Amino acid sequence: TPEVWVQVRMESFTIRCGFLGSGSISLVTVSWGGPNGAGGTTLAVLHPERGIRQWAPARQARWETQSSISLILEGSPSANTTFCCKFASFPEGSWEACGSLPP
Amino acid sequence: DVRVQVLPEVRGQLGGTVELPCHLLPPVPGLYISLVTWQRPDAPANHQNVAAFHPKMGPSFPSPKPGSERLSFVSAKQSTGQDTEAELQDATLALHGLTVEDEGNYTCEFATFPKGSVRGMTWLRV
Numbered sequence: 711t712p713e714v715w716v717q718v719r720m721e722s723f724t725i726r727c728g729f730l731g732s733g734s735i736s737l738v739t740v741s742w743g744g745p746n747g748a749g750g751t752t753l754a755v756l757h758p759e760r761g762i763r764q765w766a767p768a769r770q771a772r773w774e775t776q777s778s779i780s781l782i783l784e785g786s787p788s789a790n791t792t793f794c795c796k797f798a799s800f801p802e803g804s805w806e807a808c809g810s811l812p813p
Numbered sequence: 814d815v816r817v818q819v820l821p822e823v824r825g826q827l828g829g830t831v832e833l834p835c836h837l838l839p840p841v842p843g844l845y846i847s848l849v850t851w852q853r854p855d856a857p858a859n860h861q862n863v864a865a866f867h868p869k870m871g872p873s874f875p876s877p878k879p880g881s882e883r884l885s886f887v888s889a890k891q892s893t894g895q896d897t898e899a900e901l902q903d904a905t906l907a908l909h910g911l912t913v914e915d916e917g918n919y920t921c922e923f924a925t926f927p928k929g930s931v932r933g934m935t936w937l938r939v
């Protein structure tokens with residue numbers, strides 16, 4: 711089973727997330743407060759060749775590895791705030807996980 | 814700017830064949846579809862992804878539960894060369910030999926570049 715991991719830390723604050731799977735990544739999307747495209751507020755879209763799109767809270771976005779990304783956001787996030795990362799990958803499909811700051 | 818056109822409910826007959834329509838409806842210049850994924854959110858995790866289509870490499874059906882023997886993409890086209898581009902905007906699924914196991918919610922999701930994840934949801938009944 712593929713696995714998505716999410717780590718949220720205070721630096722402004724940083725969202726890091728990555729995909730542990732058996733295929734390459736076609737797209738990464740990052741959202742605030744709920745699932746990507748299904749309730750959450752979009753923060754960033756990352757494509758391996760076409761680049762990065764980002765929305766206001768997110769100030770910086772980058773690939774940390776070929777399977778993981780990092781976002782810097784201007785804050786404010788609470789311990790209860792959820793951040794979700796969705797990885798679209800062939801052949802396994804789309805996989806998402808959500809995380810929050812350590813209380 | 815873009816939305817997924819699906820039917821709210823699809824009704825099928827046991828042993829028969831049905832289609833689940835899914836179109837990213839407004840053709841928008843500069844909008845790229847990098848992947849299409851069909852999921853059954855009600856399923857266990859290892860059975861949730863039931864179909865995927867890649868612009869270059871075509872379809873996969875990683876869950877066995879409907880599985881590749883009874884599921885197919887009706888219209889999605891992979892790119893055939895450096896001349897011709899993939900056509901993923903019609904993600905309609907066909908399901909054959911319908912069984913009670915196939916009933917449930919199905920989500921069709923486009924992984925699009927500028928816009929992000931765009932999805933619609935259908936309920937299939939048998």
Ligand SMILES: *[C@@H]1O[C@H](CO)[C@@H](O)[C@H](O)[C@H]1NC(C)=O
Pocket residue numbers: 788789790791
């Ligand atoms: C989350 O935490 C913030 C700060 O403590 C608070 O204002 C907000 O009401 C909380 N939200 C929920 C849904 O509990």
